[PDB]
Design a protein around this ligand. Sequence first.
Ligand SMILES: *C(=O)N1CCC(N2C(=O)[C@H](c3ccc(F)cc3)[C@H]2c2ccc(C(=O)OC)cc2)CC1
Length: 280
Amino acid sequence: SPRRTPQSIPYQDLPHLVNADGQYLFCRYWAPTGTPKALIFVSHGAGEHSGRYEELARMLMGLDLLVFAHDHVGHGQSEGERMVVSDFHVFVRDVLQHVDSMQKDYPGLPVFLLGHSMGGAIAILTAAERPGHFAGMVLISPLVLANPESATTFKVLAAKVGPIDSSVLSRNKTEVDIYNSDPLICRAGLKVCFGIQLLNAVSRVERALPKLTVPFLLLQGSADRLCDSKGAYLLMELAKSQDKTLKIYEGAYHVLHKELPEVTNSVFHEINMWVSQRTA
Ligand SMILES: *C(=O)N1CCC(N2C(=O)[C@H](c3ccc(F)cc3)[C@H]2c2ccc(C(=O)OC)cc2)CC1
């Protein structure tokens, strides 16, 4: 019987990969017409999927980069129980599988990571697992901090065994409406087991910072209620990277690449300049 996405589309008709656990991951590619100058993997956040990066990926592809992504396990069109992961390292392992496959096909090219929220924690853990392997990282409100009250709470709830208000994601109301009606987004509350894996991700990110040397661009909104801006300042201070830059968007919420047009246009421009300077 054909393996199908959670939306019932056969994987045989879609770009995909099978991970180390035998699970099908839905893949996306945005390849330039000419020979690519670099590769870039796009790592999405919790509850979302790779299609949300369509416009950013088309901008990167226009700079002669070959952009690629997959929906993380338990997300979007990939297999797995929704927003469940046996251990957070599965996300890192699967990104390395896809990166290694692309590097086999395009040897010699520099490879960048771009990650938002949970996807940024995955990008940090990926670059920390292979020091010197990546040319750079673009982090948009990465998940690097855990609230201590939620942390102790989830540990006790896990020893025994609510959806986010979409308006906190962005000040751009049309983008909030798009988010609320995308069938590939999981807007359900956090499962206790997955909350534990996000706390593991935060703890692992803390331990990786003394070894994190990859160049990075960090974009953070000052009014982000999901990833507090304090974490972006701590990441700038604690990462060992010789090439690190922070840009703060005053008043902006969490999803900077889908924020008010003035913020989104600046985010696209800053990522373009940063990646262009490091692929020249
Ligand atoms: C990006 O993919 N992410 C943004 C942050 C989000 N998140 C945490 O880091 C919080 C959390 C809580 C308990 C845990 F056990 C593990 C992680 C969770 C969260 C933060 C803020 C809110 C909110 O509504 O603020 C107003 C809801 C959830 C993970 C995904």
